[model samples]
Target chain A: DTTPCCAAAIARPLPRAHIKEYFYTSGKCSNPAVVFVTRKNRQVCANPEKKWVREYINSLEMS
Target chain B: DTTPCCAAAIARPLPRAHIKEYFYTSGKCSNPAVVFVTRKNRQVCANPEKKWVREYINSLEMS
Candidate 1:
């Protein structure tokens, strides 16, 4: 017996990962520290965090 | 023999790029750290330590 007015506060701010300016650029690719997808789709593997890197992969519909 | 494909159970997750709503706005461009494309397409470039500033580039086919 409770009304919907008592719902918990939900903060639905935009996800930073999807931010376009944060996207890796052409110049960024040259930097060793700046991770990028390779022409062969393979590169020297490193343990940098991929949690927020916005990779522009080939056309594939994401469900 | 260390068969490369046989030894790995890897992960492939969504790249944060294609998601909508990350593009830069007119107001945010005034900020110094934001790497913005101006009407003349030039600016004072400064490296900022923050991520998540969105960039709204002109429409072009990303082929």
Candidate 2:
């Protein structure tokens, strides 16, 4: 058995959708923030606005 | 923009986890059920136990 500090968050599902992009933060944090965008134009993530969090978010959509 | 008939559901996050398996139901259902199991021993899904739903569930874990 295991317990994660943060609960996973679900996004609104879209028809004909696929994960357009996905990324996760890197650091010593127990749970690095993970986020993804849907082809149908939705953004969803486990955490938001933290320094590392933003870094990965930008990295996923950017080069 | 598109709308899925069912809302996505999130499961409790688990440490050192990976999706062990995943499956989706078939037939004419607008939102066919989708389910997955985590290596951390969690089972999560969008819908549960409809006739076709159970079919996929069985298919995933079985042959």
Candidate 3:
């Protein structure tokens, strides 16, 4: 398989506590993906455009 | 500014969807990072130590 990309996104708002970290799928994939890898090693996808998602990211960036 | 690193891991798992591509943060940062920049221009920092992060980087390359 071509370095796998997120084929699907999860429907939930994303539970941060269980997430280990995340990465964006390469354009190489036909469908875009925001991949979230959980502590359990689950590769869940999310809609990159969700405002809620960006907000969560903000917390990681500020002082 | 110094090339950014992921100081704090996102409590949740991740993405910027259809990631435009990814690049590694230099040794300049105290922390090493796998940064994924998506089409929307959101650049994310992931823990390079994480298996998932490394997975994406590997796939991101080798084209």
Candidate 4:
């Protein structure tokens, strides 16, 4: 039996099409992370420090 | 006096950079509209029926 330890690890590399909202959170963790909501109504956490993740989040705020 | 009436009319052509959130609403209106929160913490409403507004909202959901 295998169980995922971190939610961010499971939800990494999320597609922009699936994302509904994105925000930063400390979430009882050592480092801050980005929390996103998917079109399927799933909440996924990702490392905000990552380049791609940061870029994606930034793109959401641009015209 | 140029007191604008419709919220959608006032908030049309919003910049993506200023947008913080987007959602559909039919609050006391005949047609559905898009309500968005700006980075400045302002809540603005726009007509979802507009092409640009619709497109912008759709783009927010893509990777």
Candidate 5:
């Protein structure tokens, strides 16, 4: 949880193979986000509305 | 966005001065939480139900 709680989420898609896990951030801020961690342990903030990110989130749900 | 989406939130209280910001997690999981970012820029996941945590959350609701 060290990264800024996502002042902004990336507009681009991250390769699905690179992502290890993902979770939702509360919508309390102007920009609510989905935090995605890569296989190498990099955190990327992504917009929940993005088609690719949403698919990833749905696929990764219940994990 | 690099750390694992908080699997758990700490039950202990973090000093108010240490917290920079916090927001809620969508309650899709058993441990939905509030992430507390400290002035030193550390992210601490906190249990949203705790009395102290609730107070801190209310106080830090805006900006």
Candidate 6:
């Protein structure tokens, strides 16, 4: 999803804050597996690289 | 889950009506993940899909 959003193009040069905020808001992350919603609505499980932290932050931003 | 359902002997041919109802009402679907509840109850994750739908519906009927 981020691919169409131009995340990959800009992500290389973007700061961690920008990436983190974007991920927190988009509900889609660099990682394919796992998902994050809100601070209170957080759920984490096994995945390739513990992407839940990123997904959670991303989902929170969207929420 | 389906195994148990079959083991219990439900008189149906894997009816999709029952399956979709379980997915929508029970909160399983295309995403194949998370869970659904009647309402917000402390951010519970919805259950799995396909297999889980059968299991959950069976559990509900069991209860």
Assess candidate 1 and give its lDDT: 0.23
The CA lDDT of each predicted structure is: 0.23, 0.42, 0.59, 0.54, 0.68, 0.29
**Per-residue lDDT tens digits of candidate 6, residues A1-63?**
201111121111212232222221123333333322223332222132444445545554676
Q: For residue A45, what is the lDDT in candidate 2? A: 43
Question: What TM value does model 2 have?
Answer: 0.27
Question: How would you class the docking of model 5?
Answer: incorrect
**What tens digits encode model 2's per-residue C-alpha lDDT throughout B1-63?**
011112343443223225566544232334444545567544344455455445545665675
- DockQ each: 0.03, 0.03, 0.04, 0.02, 0.13, 0.02
Q: Where does model 5 exceed 4 Å of error?
A: A1-4, B1-63
Residue-by-residue lDDT tens digits, candidate 4, B1-63? 011112324334877888766755434333335656678755465766688777777778762
The positional error of residue A25 in candidate 2, measured at the CA in angstroms, is: 16
Q: Which order, best to worst by TM-score?
A: 5, 3, 4, 2, 6, 1
**Candidate 1 segments exceeding 4 Å error:** A1-22, A32-63, B1-34, B38-63
User: lDDT tens string, model 1, A1-63?
Assistant: 000010111123223333222122222222212222234322121212343232322111131
Candidate 1 lDDT by residue in tens digits, B1-63: 000011111122113343222211122123323233334322212223333222222221231
Q: Tell me the deviation in Å of residue B7 in model 6.
A: 33
Question: Could you arrange the candidates by lDDT from highest to lowest?
Answer: 5, 3, 4, 2, 6, 1
Deviating ranges (above 4 Å) for candidate 2 = A1-20, A23-45, B1-45, B54-63
| Clashing residue pairs for model 2 | none
Count the clashes in each prediction: 0, 0, 6, 5, 2, 12
* lDDT for each residue of candidate 4 in A12-42, tens digit (9 for 90 to 100): 4767788777755434433335666678755
**Better model by DockQ: candidate 3 vs candidate 6:** 3
Error of 1 at A22 (Å): 5.4
Q: TM-score of every model?
A: 0.17, 0.27, 0.44, 0.39, 0.47, 0.19
Q: Which stretches of candidate 6 lie over 4 Å from their true place?
A: A1-63, B1-34, B38-40, B47-50
Candidate 1 or 4, higher DockQ? 1
Which model scores highest in lDDT? 5
lDDT of 2 at B10: 41
Best by TM-score: 5
Better of 2 and 3 by DockQ: 3
